Design a protein around this nucleic acid. Structure first.
Ligand SMILES: [K+]
Ligand SMILES: [K+]
Ligand SMILES: [K+]
Ligand SMILES: [Mg+2]
Ligand SMILES: [Mg+2]
Ligand SMILES: [Mg+2]
Lengths: 76, 97, 120, 191, 81
RNA sequence: UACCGUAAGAAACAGCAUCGGCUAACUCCUGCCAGCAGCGAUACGGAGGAUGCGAGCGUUAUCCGGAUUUAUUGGGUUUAAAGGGUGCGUAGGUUGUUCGGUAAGUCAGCGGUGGAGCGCUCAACGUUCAGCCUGCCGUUGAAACUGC
RNA sequence: GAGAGUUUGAUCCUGGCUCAGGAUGAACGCUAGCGAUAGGCUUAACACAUGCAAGUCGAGGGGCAGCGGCGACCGGCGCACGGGUGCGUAACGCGUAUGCAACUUGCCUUACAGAGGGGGAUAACCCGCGGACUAAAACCGCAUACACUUGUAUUAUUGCAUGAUAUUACAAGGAAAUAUAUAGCUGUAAGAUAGGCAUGCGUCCCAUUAGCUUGUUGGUGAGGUAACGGCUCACAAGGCGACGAUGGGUAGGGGAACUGAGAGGUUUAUCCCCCACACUGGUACUGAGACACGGACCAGACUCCUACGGGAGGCAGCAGUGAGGAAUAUUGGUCAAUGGGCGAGAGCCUGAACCAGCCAAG
């Protein structure tokens, strides 16, 4: 029972932050303005890095996402 | 973790142990990385030991069990304290005692 | 054949058949005496006691009854081992005496272990 | 197991006095049975003669034979048979016959190198000491066989009566062992 | 001071596919049972950045990481046409 | 390890007409036995002796060798089984002689990798070192033969 | 490194058959004294009841109703190992030998840096499956790190194509645990250990199994992954096959072991390495790591109990019992030794393992 309760609570906790980050990248992926992208990037990168160092996702996954978004904003 | 332990390789009523370096998850008499000696508690206890390899593994960080730690305390394998260059350069000789 | 013929085709080795196929690679089987009857040899002219038995391995065979004097009857559970009789076509199995329903030969003083008789 | 049966029957079967001296060796000397040969028969007679004269059963005899083959094979099989605790005790004269020597060894009466060994098949290597137990040096039966007889006809035993011990100098050659056994027949049979 | 990868010398067998070729490597080896020497051939898939290889060419190819579903080799040289 | 008082508590099973080691008498003259020559008795059943093995002895079942009874080492096809009814020909297998190249087969070197003791009172068995790694891979050379 | 019999009235060949030998996790008949050392459901991934088999930390926290320590709860680590089974699987599954300039790696060792400041719920408790306050080494921001990630460079050096290793910079972003000297906590790097992917060669029969494939083959781009890749998603058309594709049947694979002078062969009984599995399927979740062996959810058998509103089990862990069968044992003792898990240690747990009991029993 203890294992079941811990797994359910941790599953909900991980789902919260993973879904928030996924929605953040989805919203960022429709941006067009360069200055808007520049001022929206750092908080999204911070959230992704916090997730990666928090073990919800992997460090290589966060690095890949950050590289993709930086290479996108480097080309308007 | 990597360990230094003894596998019971003998006969019923006559325990003969092999000193090996093996993962902690491996079975007792199963897989090992390197054989570093033998051990027989029936005599009055004959110990075979590879000094250089035992020093190398205790240096890279293999954790020995209690009995293997006693076996390494004998034959002077735990002289890493003296070999750590503790404000000196010579080598003492405590094996004669 | 030539070396290339052997390379292309090769050699084929057959499999030797088992002399007791109804046992299914077992030393002994258990059966029930479906029928108990008598047969005539193929230059002997005797009256050999045989039983048709349906073994537990879904097979029916004929088993000779060695010795003199059998207490068996129809619908009797018997132990069947290999071994054939030369002058009798058909039968290729024996019934172990002294096991299950089959009793040992009475009045036997020699070759006792082959007929299931205890020491007197 | 052991034979523990009638010995004169085997003596009269084989003709030779394997067990020793008896009146039946000269009176009524013929193979036993109220009713009393191929090369198989003679080979079997030779092998059984060796087995009965040395108290060895079939599996031990076969082990001795192929051990001798691994390490003339028939020549050293005979010295392997001779190098036995009971046989060495009997040849030292401390016991009358080979059965008596076997019983003495099996009981706590014989030591090898100062330690009591009671296995009456223990191979004795050269340069070893076999001696009577120090607690059994004063038995009524233990002394009449050695003292008085004093044969000492074998040039590979040292006796040393002053210590009641004995030593095997070396394995005797096939010519100096007084056994009427044709090892060629046995090695041909087992080959 | 690196490690070495596998190298295969062969003959081009197909180039109809874009940016990739097929290389045939043939050798004679002893039969295990009868000891005769028989011919064997193997086909490799190689990656070439230009369709510069025609049907039949002594070439050398080198092992690589998976570049496609079945593409683990790359062209290195052309011995002859 | 030591002390009393006693051989005292401890031997079966198979087969003896040939192959094979081991033979008199009584039964039966169907009952029976068998791995074969077969007997229905120096072969069936018992009694006496004999011969094997021996805490085992026999029966059945399974797998190897003798078997060359799949034959590369190491078999054959007139008459014992075994040449296609006869040709042409595709793939494949084989290739007269000689002069040079190459190094795929082949050969060689160098690396990597995978009996003697001791202790069981003896032995099975434990254990150590001398001893094969002769399989695979890498790297250097040789050119008589096969291939190109 | 060998033979014997057997077709004839009698020969010499050919050829099958039968004995003689060696070995069984064998069974049966007769008969049985001891010791040592091995082995013990080979039949069905058959059904049953009971008990045990994975817990530990009061040097993490709120409590003590219990005399110091601890029932219970929150929290850390472990239960993916040890142990069991051979269903499935002709496959980079396995064996052998390599590559990753396409990889990940808790616990362990070493080196370099740092541990500064705050706030929410909530379990238990209390009050009646509902209501309110609670603490952190539980949870989540802020400050700092340019040793790390990302992006843009310069100086290079050097490869096996895509490139790799270092320096010198700017920018952004990412941590902590303290407790009573010890035990520790965080980031980075190296090592060690363990996994993952891809390769050359080897890997059972059937042609009374001849064509197979339509993300199937390749290219461009994107997404996804620890990572390359039709892994997935939006032009050309291909690829693989008589050196056996495809389809069907049967097997877990090796070292061992047995057995042949050799050639070899047979078989995986004990033992060791790899793979697959946990009543049957599907999906995941938590985790450094999952086919999740004493964890879920759903769908299917089957079985058991209720009190008809509702719930439970999978015996391929160790032992009883029943059935199947020719046939294979105790509902035993101890953690004393070896090995594991947790713990600062003492220590606790361990049907692994050490032992003992039973069995013509090798
Ligand atoms: K000691
Ligand atoms: K973990
Ligand atoms: K323990
Ligand atoms: Mg014995
Ligand atoms: Mg003909
Ligand atoms: Mg013709």
């Amino acid at each position: 029972e203890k294992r079941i309760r811990q797994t359910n609570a941790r599953r909900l906790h991980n789902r919260y932050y993973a879904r928030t980050a996924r929605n953040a990248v989805k919203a960022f992926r429709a941006l067009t303005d360069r200055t808007e992208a520049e001022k929206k990037y750092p908080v999204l990168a911070s959230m992704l890095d916090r997730l990666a160092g928090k073990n919800i996702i992997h460090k290589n996954k966060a690095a890949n996402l950050k590289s993709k978004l930086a290479r996108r904003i480097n080309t308007l | 973790a990597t360990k230094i332990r003894l596998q019971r390789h003998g006969r019923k009523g006559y325990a003969f142990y092999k000193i090996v370096v093996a993962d902690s998850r491996a079975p007792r008499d199963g897989k090992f990385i390197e054989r570093i000696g033998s051990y027989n508690p029936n005599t009055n206890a004959t110990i075979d030991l590879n000094f250089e390899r035992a020093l190398y593994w205790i240096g890279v960080g293999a954790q020995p069990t209690d009995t293997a730690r006693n076996i390494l305390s004998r034959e002077g394998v735990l002289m890493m304290k003296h070999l750590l260059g503790g404000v000196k350069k010579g080598a003492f000789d405590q094996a004669a005692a | 054949p030539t070396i290339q013929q052997l390379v292309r085709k090769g050699r084929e080795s057959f499999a030797d058949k088992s002399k007791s196929p109804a046992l299914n690679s077992c030393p002994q089987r258990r059966g029930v005496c479906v029928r108990v009857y008598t047969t005539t040899p193929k230059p002997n002219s005797a009256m050999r006691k045989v039983a048709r038995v349906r073994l537990t391995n879904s097979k029916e065979v004929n088993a000779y009854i060695p010795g003199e004097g059998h207490n068996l009857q129809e619908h009797s559970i018997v132990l069947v081992r290999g071994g054939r009789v030369k002058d009798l076509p058909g039968v290729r199995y024996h019934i172990v005496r002294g096991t299950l329903d089959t009793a040992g030969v009475n009045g036997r003083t020699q070759r006792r272990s082959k007929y299931g008789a205890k020491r007197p | 197991a052991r034979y523990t049966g009638p010995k004169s029957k085997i003596a009269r079967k084989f003709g030779d006095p394997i067990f020793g001296a008896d009146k039946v060796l000269s009176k009524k000397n013929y193979p036993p049975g109220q009713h009393g040969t191929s090369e198989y028969g003679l080979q079997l007679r030779e092998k059984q003669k060796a087995k009965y004269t040395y108290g060895v059963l079939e599996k031990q005899f076969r082990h001795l034979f192929h051990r001798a083959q691994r390490a003339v094979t028939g020549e050293l099989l005979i010295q392997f048979l001779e190098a036995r605790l009971d046989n060495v005790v009997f040849r030292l004269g401390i016991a009358p016959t080979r059965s008596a020597a076997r019983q003495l060894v099996s009981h706590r009466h014989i030591t090898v190198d100062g330690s009591v060994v009671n296995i009456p098949s223990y191979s004795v290597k050269p340069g070893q000491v076999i001696g009577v137990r120090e607690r059994s040096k004063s038995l009524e039966v233990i002394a009449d066989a050695l003292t008085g007889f004093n044969h000492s006809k074998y040039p590979w035993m040292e006796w040393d009566q002053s210590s009641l011990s004995g030593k095997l100098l070396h394995m005797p050659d096939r010519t100096d062992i007084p056994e009427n056994i044709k090892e060629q027949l046995i090695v041909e049979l087992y080959s | 001071e690196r490690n070495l990868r596998k190298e295969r010398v062969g003959v081009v067998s197909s180039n109809k596919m874009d940016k990739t070729i097929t290389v045939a490597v043939k050798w004679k080896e002893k039969h295990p049972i009868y000891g005769k020497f028989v011919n064997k051939t193997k086909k490799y898939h190689a990656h070439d950045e230009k369709n510069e290889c025609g049907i039949g060419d002594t070439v050398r190819i080198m092992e690589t990481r998976p570049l496609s579903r079945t593409k683990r080799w790359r062209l290195t040289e052309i011995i002859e046409r």
